[PDB]
Design a protein around this ligand. Sequence first.
Ligand SMILES: *[C@@H]1O[C@H](CO)[C@@H](O)[C@H](O)[C@H]1NC(C)=O
Length: 153
Amino acid sequence: YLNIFISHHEVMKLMGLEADLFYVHEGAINTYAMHFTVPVPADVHELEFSWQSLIAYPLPYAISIEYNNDQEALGTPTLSIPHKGLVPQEIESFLVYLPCTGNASLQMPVNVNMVVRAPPRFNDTRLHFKRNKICAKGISPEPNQSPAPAHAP
Ligand SMILES: *[C@@H]1O[C@H](CO)[C@@H](O)[C@H](O)[C@H]1NC(C)=O
């Protein structure tokens, strides 16, 4: 009833291979793949997840993040979607932003927790995505709002 996967482009960005990876396929969790800790290079500033509900019954989701607050190398992770809502019935993708400050070099765990509530005939999908974020000094995401020369009137 539920697909959760990372696309070909996401696997190429993260790992350099041409493949996709379904972490959940029609409700079945890829427990083997969930064991792995995926490294996130210094120059990768976001993780992209893709998902799709395969039924009409509403699928509530909840997303939480695990990371050490108390350091100077990684800024606060954010989402491109609300941390709670419904899983879409068309394939959609969302981002977990992992913005390294560029003011420090460091490796650290960042884990993404997801819970998708199931209709009563199935069991909830509980996921613990393990990632190890690399940060490097002088490597940080660029802003997309561009500067403009300014002077006083
Ligand atoms: C953000 O978009 C701007 C376009 O103004 C571009 O200069 C920059 O390279 C982009 N950076 C990222 C991380 O998307």
